[PDB]
């Protein structure tokens, strides 16, 4: 019963047991019916926390490995530990990416939900790009870029400039330009246009969505401040 798997997912959440939450939401998805707005947010929260733990660890260990000049048995062991963390992280990304390809994107029947799943594809290819070897990287980077670009084109045609999902996509796409493609002028320009077009609404923003929009607009401007300095 889907209803029972969804109840367990919530319970796992409140216990802060995110691997359990992710396994329940993978099973719901695997039943083949389109997800509700509630179920789609659960899936996204479980996997954000499972992959986040690894990425945070990866940066700690990778930064220790580089800082150590010499001690070639200690540097070797660091390198080994970084590789083991990388293997966990790649598995998680590949699970997510495969759910999106087989069930979530082909079935998405509204612009809102198709933009959401496309942005998620660009995010998870970007996580693989943070840790890709140099021969496989260029192929991974282009997959991230194409998923973000198709999302960006649908949202600009179908959604208002203040819609939270449209604003979150411009926030993440613009960080892709800055850190993955090392193109700060493009990153700034994309963030400033999305901030300005949203301000343009001295007109219509709904009372249930306004708090979310305003929060993400302040995130866009904090990035612009950091990158300008």
């Amino acid at each position: 019963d889907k209803n029972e798997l969804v109840q367990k997912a919530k319970l796992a959440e409140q216990a802060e047991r995110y691997d359990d939450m992710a396994a329940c939401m993978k099973s719901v998805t695997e039943q083949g019916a389109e997800l509700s707005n509630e179920e789609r947010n659960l899936l996204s929260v479980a996997y954000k926390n499972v992959v986040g733990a690894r990425r945070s660890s990866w940066r700690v260990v990778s930064s220790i490995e580089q800082k150590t000049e010499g001690a070639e048995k200690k540097q070797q062991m660091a390198r080994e530990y970084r590789e083991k963390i990388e293997t966990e992280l790649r598995d998680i990304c590949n699970d997510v990416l495969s759910l999106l390809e087989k069930f979530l994107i082909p079935n998405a029947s509204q612009a809102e939900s198709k933009v959401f799943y496309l942005k998620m594809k660009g995010d998870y290819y970007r996580y693989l790009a943070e840790v890709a070897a140099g021969d496989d990287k260029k192929g991974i980077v282009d997959q991230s870029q194409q998923a973000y670009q198709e999302a960006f084109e649908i949202s600009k045609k179908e959604m208002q400039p203040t819609h939270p999902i449209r604003l979150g996509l411009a926030l993440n796409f613009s960080v892709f330009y800055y850190e993955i493609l090392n193109s700060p002028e493009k990153a700034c320009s994309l963030a400033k246009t999305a901030f300005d077009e949203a301000i343009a609404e001295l007109d219509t923003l709904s009372e249930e969505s306004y708090k979310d929009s305003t929060l993400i607009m302040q995130l866009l401007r904090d990035n612009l401040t950091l990158w300008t300095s």
């Binding site: 929260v45 954000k48 986040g52 995010d123 979150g168 926030l171 960080v175 995130l219 990158w227």
Partner: peptide, 9 residues
């Protein structure tokens, strides 16, 4: 110090 992406963890 870290730049923002969303969803946050």
């Amino acid at each position: 110090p870290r730049r923002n992406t969303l969803p946050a963890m």
